[PDB]
Design a protein around this ligand. Structure first.
Ligand SMILES: *[C@@H]1O[C@H](CO)[C@@H](O)[C@H](O)[C@H]1NC(C)=O
Ligand SMILES: *[C@@H]1O[C@H](CO)[C@@H](O)[C@H](O)[C@H]1NC(C)=O
Lengths: 402, 100, 50
């Protein structure tokens, strides 16, 4: 009845763990129950990730739910590829087809490339952060030569937080040499709130500018500060709060005590945490299908040292790979399904434009269909003051005597 | 393999690393204080206990593109070798008016 | 030395003295002048342009 799994959590991911505990209760049946082993470690320090993964492998788990950084993603994917241990993660998908990895996050590269094609953009900025892999930068650069775009890629990541006022004021001075009015922000939801505040300081948020937040949590970050400046701000949202499924989840979420569940007494939830809740439903339904298929998975004994040479992989991991990669359930991230590689398939990302009345569901895409929502007859603002410019020269435009 | 040498008790490790495996060595040697001496491409950032024989080529490439007075050119790169240098010429493409 | 996944991480003392000796080496070789900074990157080096 006790199924052992390993948890690798970043120390600063409290809400991302609060959603994990809630998922344990919602999908707990009387047939069995999952037993987590949680290790809070530094996600960037890959030696700690190596020390943590091998801790769970010595305790003999069956799957591992965790995260990884750019500095540590290869450590996870290469151990799981040899030891045939299944890894479930909400971090960015691995740049390639790696077995025994269950990537809960969908691939955003297909979204951004067509949101650009929708607005008919041919020259824009792209401030990226390498903390989540250079997968998307190679996407915009490869398609920049095919469509003959004129793109400026700036590794805004490696910047110190003490000289941030003088350097951020210096980045926009370079972008002014082409008078760039179309920017794509590709940082995590933290550094975006840093750039957003520095955009307001220099006033580059009025009529004319048009930003595109490139992460799956447009509503997660704060938008009310660049809402009324007049700049059009697009984005992407994966947690559709309109669905009655999420609204059922949000209602129970908004009421839990914040001391036992940090970062949980609000009406919204970050796309990282929401994917975590939807991960438990993947794992629970994966083992339940092993039961119904009459498959025996419990370890024959001690897995031994992960550094065993030659590395002997336990065979039942393949059945766990095929069990997790063949789950198909419905959760907060909409539809959930995986291919033979563990990548998100058959999914749906909603597109969001920020207007005067707040975030507005405008569009959506799919790995088969691109930019289909037409249209948003509901909501609407019906408020548009057209800006007309002219020059003071008689008698065309003269200031009245009074 | 880094552990097969620590058990044997080496006092320093000469080797190489890839784009995918560089972070494994940099953080391992950082915690276990083993000294790594390698020619493999220099660490993107300051990682202690690593000796890079490879001199920083990216600083030399920028100076060369200036002397030739280029404005628009193609840059070919393989994601296998990496792109720490292509990143360097894409960051400096706005200040110095390059259409890469 | 034992295992590399030693918990807690026991860092031997003489490793920090080895790091200091390496970067303090200043000799001449096939690459030109070889001296290092406190991080381990080449300084006072020479790249020919051909
Ligand atoms: C794809 O998603 C649709 C909509 O949820 C679902 O009805 C269908 O069964 C899925 N197809 C496959 C092959 O999983
Ligand atoms: C710097 O390199 C030159 C060329 O090899 C050498 O003559 C000089 O002594 C070096 N500087 C120092 C401080 O050793």
């Amino acid at each position: 009845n006790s199924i052992q799994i390993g948890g690798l959590f970043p120390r600063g991911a409290d809400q991302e763990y609060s959603a994990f505990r809630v998922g344990m209760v919602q999908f707990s049946t009387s047939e069995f129950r999952l037993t987590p082993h949680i290790d809070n470690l530094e996600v960037a320090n890959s030696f700690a990730v190596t020390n943590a993964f091998c801790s769970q492998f010595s305790r003999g788990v069956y799957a591992i739910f965790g995260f990884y950084d750019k500095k540590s993603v290869n450590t996870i994917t290469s151990f799981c590829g040899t030891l045939h241990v299944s890894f479930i993660t909400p971090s960015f998908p691995t740049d390639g087809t790696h077995p025994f990895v269950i990537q809960m996050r969908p691939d955003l590269k297909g979204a951004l490339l067509s949101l650009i094609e929708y607005y008919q953009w041919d020259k824009f900025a792209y401030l990226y952060d390498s903390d989540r892999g250079l997968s998307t930068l190679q996407a915009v650069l490869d398609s920049a030569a095919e469509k003959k775009w004129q793109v400026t890629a700036i590794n805004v990541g490696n910047i110190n937080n003490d000289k941030k006022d003088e350097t951020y004021r210096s980045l926009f001075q370079d972008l002014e040499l082409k008078k760039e009015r179309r920017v794509i922000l590709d940082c995590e939801r933290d550094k975006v709130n840093d750039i957003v505040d520095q955009v307001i300081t220099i006033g580059k948020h009025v009529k004319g500018y048009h930003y595109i937040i490139a992460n799956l949590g447009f509503t997660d970050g704060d938008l009310l500060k660049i809402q009324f400046g007049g700049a059009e701000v697009s984005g992407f949202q994966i947690v559709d709060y309109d669905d009655s499924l999420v609204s059922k989840f949000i209602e129970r979420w908004s009421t839990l005590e914040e001391k036992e569940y940090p970062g949980a007494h609000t009406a919204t939830i970050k796309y990282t945490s929401a994917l975590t809740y939807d991960a438990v439903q993947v794992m629970t339904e994966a083992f339940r299908n092993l039961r119904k298929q009459r498959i025996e998975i419990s370890r024959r004994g001690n897995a031994g040292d992960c550094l065993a040479n030659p590395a002997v992989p336990w065979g039942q991991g393949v059945e766990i790979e095929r069990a997790l990669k063949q789950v198909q359930v419905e959760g907060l991230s909409g539809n959930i399904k995986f291919d033979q590689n563990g990548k998100r398939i058959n999914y749906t990302i909603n597109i969001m434009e920020l207007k005067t009345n707040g975030p507005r569901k405008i569009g959506y895409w799919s790995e088969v269909d691109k930019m289909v929502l037409t249209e948003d007859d509901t909501s609407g603002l019906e408020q548009k003051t057209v800006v007309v410019t002219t020059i003071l020269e008689s008698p065309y435009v003269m200031m009245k005597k009074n």
